[PDB]
Amino acid sequence: PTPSQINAVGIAIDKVVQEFGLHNENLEQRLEIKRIMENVFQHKLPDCSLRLYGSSCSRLGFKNSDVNIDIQFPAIMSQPDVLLLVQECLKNSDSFIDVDADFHARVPVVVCREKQSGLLCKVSAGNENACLTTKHLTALGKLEPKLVPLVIAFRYWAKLCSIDRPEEGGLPPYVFALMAIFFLQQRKEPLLPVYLGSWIEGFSLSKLGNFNLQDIEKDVVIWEHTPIKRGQVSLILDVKHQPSVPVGQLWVELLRFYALEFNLADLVISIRVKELVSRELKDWPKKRIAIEDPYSVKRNVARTLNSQPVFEYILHCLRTTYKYFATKGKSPTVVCSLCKREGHLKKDCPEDFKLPPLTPKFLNILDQVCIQCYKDFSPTIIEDQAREHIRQNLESFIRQDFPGTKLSLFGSSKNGFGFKQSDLDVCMTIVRTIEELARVLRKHSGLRNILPITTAKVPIVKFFHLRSGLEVDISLYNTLALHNTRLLSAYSAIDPRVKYLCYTMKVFTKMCDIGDASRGSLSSYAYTLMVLYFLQQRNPPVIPVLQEIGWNIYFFDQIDELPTYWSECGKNTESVGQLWLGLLRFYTEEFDFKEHVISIRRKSLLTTFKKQWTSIVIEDPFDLNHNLGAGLSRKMTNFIMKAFINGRRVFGIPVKPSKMEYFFDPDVLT
RNA sequence: UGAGGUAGUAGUGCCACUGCCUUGC
Ligand SMILES: O=c1ccn([C@@H]2O[C@H](CO[P@](=O)(S)OP(=O)(O)OP(=O)(O)O)[C@@H](O)[C@H]2O)c(=O)[nH]1
């Protein structure tokens, strides 16, 4: 390069800081809004304290950039409740407006805005790594005047190039500041040292994971090793001879190093040691950019980038900006929710979702269809006898190898809703034990096909019985499911309408082929939970919450005397078909699974963030942490919701070889 | 002795496989 053009570029690099960049008055205004927020939270959050973090304290962003504030709540306080009460305080307070919930984001945040300052603000909890890295960045910038303009210019280039937005597939701006400081560290005649010195005793490349950086104290970087060895490293080496090149030289060197000298798809841009760390050493993908935060040695901050076309776009932008300084003419390959595909912007995607008046004759037809389906699919006495007989035969055969073994029936067949053409599930009581059970099952001649699974959520052995022609699965010492199905059996016994509606829902799910657990779709347990939730959420209470009328297994179990403990007894007067149509309408519309969880444990609605399941969700009433949709993909969720809306459409519209076949038709519903 | 994410494989959306794993009541 040339010094004259370097100074010319530095003029603009400083101007971009002066205009559309943080300046002392802007920092003072940010401090003032922080004091105002402290005043707002004075009475409600005296124990807790507020911290200024992010671009607001880094001075590496822009005036438009949001105001990031952190809630350093004490140990007793928890992030969910603290953030929720913060949002409530923001809502009630008149200073701020348009207070909303942004909990869906990757980082738990609350969005706010002041009608006076007119600046977007975001309140977070925890996230001490971001605060630490921002503090380090601002300390280095204050120590080195060249760093701040360079990082500001990188941020502005990212914003103009559309890579700033994480949703659009671009990498976070903080990672760009980390890239800039990494370049400052690596380049020849480095201005700054690394905080992990190879000269320190007991240091090796394979030990990099053990080493970590805690925080900067007294302008000295503190790092710990996991006896414990700690070595203090000064931020600036005691060197009086350093390059005097303007900031434009640093910017051009950054562009040269990143565009040409460095292979973004070969090594990791992480500031841990001087030695160039190979990708295979720390076991990271070589496809896309990989970076590790200095204070987080087990996090890939570049996970936002997941599209090779985006990588090519970024590389082309780097090359063209380097050529210009030695940004336009193309559109970004925006990544979105739908299978990481371009499609339509992440905001709206095809996968994301959202008649004549009802007549007595159509309602009667619907009730007739529901009751007919129940009666036809109701397990016959002979069918129940056959089921218990095959279970008894299996138990007797097993007793030969495992004396004193108890084999219990659970689910639809016993202590639950009956059904036909439904797989049989049983529980065993007394990874090697499941293997022995599978082996002894293989020894049997009756059952021929056995498919054991020990890596599933629950160990299981499933096989097909020829004599009864039934798919029988056995779980190992699983007693939670017994109580789970007993609760629903009691619910059904309370009112016949519950049983009718659950039978109808099971028929619909089985006909629509969305009730196969092994394929990843929600099991019939989830659909029973959903129908029970609708039962409890009806404007009149059809069934009171038996619960709250190594987890809680206590709930009301007295069918006869429910009215005494249930003030609103017999309040609902709707028909079975009316209940089914209402459930379909409620789930298709007027309900959202993103901000709510399908839980029948308590009457009060439970928000998703309380369970921390940011990304349909169904909560097992007995196992709060367990989620039925954890192993469910987005595609299957959208298929299930499409099936539900199709069922709502077919059932809602009145119409004037059998009535059963007209409804629950797999072709019509799919 | 199966559905989804992650590196790779010769012919050329060309596609089926193969190394590991959360998920396969
Ligand atoms: O995540 C879970 C937790 C529990 N269960 C357990 O599944 C049971 C309900 O089982 P179903 O969903 S009517 O399956 P079916 O084929 O209709 O009858 P089956 O029971 O397999 O003989 C019920 O006891 C519940 O506790 C799951 O299937 N998935």
Side-chain angles (χ1 to χ4, degrees), chain A residues 410-412 422-424 473 481 484-485 506 510 523-525 626 628:
Chain A
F410 87 100
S412 309
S422 97
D423 291 5
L424 202 163
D473 72 44
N484 285 13
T485 198
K506 272 201 209 186
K510 287 255 181 196
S523 307
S524 179
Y525 183 46
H626 190 292
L628 285 68

Side-chain angles (χ1 to χ4, degrees), chain A residues 14-17 19-76 78-134 136-167:
Chain A
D14 193 47
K15 196 187 68 50
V16 168
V17 176
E19 193 279 322
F20 193 61
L22 268 292
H23 154 273
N24 182 33
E25 82 202 349
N26 304 73
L27 191 54
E28 288 166 346
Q29 176 311 322
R30 272 137 198 290
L31 265 298
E32 178 268 346
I33 164 174
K34 203 182 81 62
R35 298 315 308 285
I36 290 281
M37 171 85 48
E38 287 284 4
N39 179 10
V40 165
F41 292 169
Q42 180 57 78
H43 71 287
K44 272 254 201 158
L45 302 93
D47 59 305
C48 315
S49 153
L50 323 180
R51 174 190 298 164
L52 201 43
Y53 96 100
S55 169
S56 90
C57 192
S58 313
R59 185 140 41 86
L60 306 176
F62 328 107
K63 89 189 199 68
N64 174 327
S65 80
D66 82 5
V67 180
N68 318 87
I69 173 154
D70 169 358
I71 314 297
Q72 51 170 260
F73 61 94
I76 64 190
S78 203
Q79 163 164 269
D81 74 280
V82 161
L83 196 51
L84 192 58
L85 72 88
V86 162
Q87 201 196 339
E88 179 174 9
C89 287
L90 260 294
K91 279 196 290 294
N92 63 36
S93 153
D94 73 315
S95 309
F96 301 72
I97 88 180
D98 61 62
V99 179
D100 63 81
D102 196 33
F103 291 63
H104 298 119
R106 174 169 154 282
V107 56
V109 288
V110 163
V111 160
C112 323
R113 174 173 291 93
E114 289 274 47
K115 65 177 175 280
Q116 305 86 15
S117 85
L119 306 170
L120 171 58
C121 328
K122 272 152 58 48
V123 194
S124 310
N127 194 16
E128 95 309 5
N129 298 298
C131 299
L132 284 160
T133 184
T134 37
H136 149 258
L137 258 49
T138 185
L140 266 57
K142 178 215 78 189
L143 292 159
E144 301 280 28
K146 301 136 279 166
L147 180 61
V148 157
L150 175 128
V151 177
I152 285 276
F154 214 97
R155 294 271 291 92
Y156 187 52
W157 164 89
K159 198 97 131 183
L160 247 200
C161 177
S162 323
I163 329 307
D164 193 295
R165 264 161 301 281
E167 306 336 329

Side-chain angles (χ1 to χ4, degrees), chain A residues 387 409-413 415 417 419 421-424 426 457 471 473 478 480-486 488 506 510 515 517 523-526 528 620 626-628:
Chain A
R387 288 173 138 84
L409 189 42
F410 87 100
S412 309
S413 309
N415 322 290
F417 302 77
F419 204 71
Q421 310 198 349
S422 97
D423 291 5
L424 202 163
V426 308
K457 186 66 163 277
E471 171 46 0
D473 72 44
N478 168 238
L480 155 64
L482 188 62
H483 294 246
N484 285 13
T485 198
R486 214 181 51 81
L488 317 193
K506 272 201 209 186
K510 287 255 181 196
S523 307
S524 179
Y525 183 46
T528 316
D620 167 40
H626 190 292
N627 181 283
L628 285 68

Side-chain angles (χ1 to χ4, degrees), chain A residues 88 96 351 359 569:
Chain A
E88 179 174 9
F96 301 72
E351 301 295 30
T359 89
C569 178

